[PDB]
Symmetry: C4
Subunit: 91 residues, 4 copies
């Protein structure tokens, strides 16, 4: 479950990294950063796609990727960190 | 369900696209982009409504549209992509 | 329920409107706009508090107000718009 | 529960405050502010990490910290403010 969500999240971010570095001309690290803050809804106060292709892709990217990213964040906290933390709580 | 949420989401975005292009003078694609990043809470680091009418509308738009947009994103991931993905998981 | 959440949300936004217009010197409408986009997590790409008092207040404001605002948005969509929409669905 | 989530949230914010003030050179209050708006997804329309180290850390920080911060916000509203409010509702 967590493994699959992990892989799915990685593939989604790779796609965004490739798209923004190609179409919007961002350095790969910047394309990855933008992809991450966009899908987690944090957003960036500096960059917004400048091309119409970038704007359309971003719209579709958000709708398709938000659900996945938060499902992963969910399991990552309830199925990976909760126990690890809740474990020590045990005297 | 997904069909209705889809239509409802589309109508909400059309309303925002018309409003921002008219009152804030944005190009239609930019008005649609702003509407999408606003209702998904991603936000935009470049544009913020410049008119008081735009500010008031945006406030009301957020409160009324956020619930709908995320309900659609929810079903879109749990009722449309989960199975499609979870399907292959089956050897 | 919805009435109480409505009132509670209104009071929270009034407090933010008063604070930002006073300490950060924003026009009341701008203070209200900032309060709304902050608590809904949309954010603003133009304004960020400039004073340390404003930064500290915003931090506390977010933690205390986010829960309330989304609880209201929740009921507003499930207890006020869902039925109104789901009603017509009935032939 | 709320106590543990409180402590965990505090430690996470301390780590972000130390990181951004050191690597990105922000004043401690600004580093804390950025950490808070990033993990709550509000975001900042003015600052974005300028270093690659800052960008990578932020990506990891978001994925690991978002789950915790919202779990705390959740309990803080349902286990700390709901009753306090719901109490008076009682004639
Ligand atoms: Cs945001
Ligand atoms: Na958000
Ligand atoms: Na934002």
């Amino acid at each position: 479950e967590f493994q699959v969500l992990f892989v799915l999240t990685i593939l989604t971010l790779i796609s965004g990294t490739i798209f923004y570095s190609t179409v919007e001309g961002l350095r790969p690290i910047d394309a990855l950063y933008f992809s991450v803050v966009t899908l987690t809804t944090v957003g960036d106060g500096n960059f917004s796609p400048q091309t119409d292709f970038g704007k359309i892709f971003t719209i579709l990217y958000i709708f398709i990727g938000i659900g996945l990213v938060f499902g992963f964040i969910h399991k990552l906290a309830v199925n990976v960190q909760l126990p690890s933390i809740l474990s020590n709580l045990v005297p």
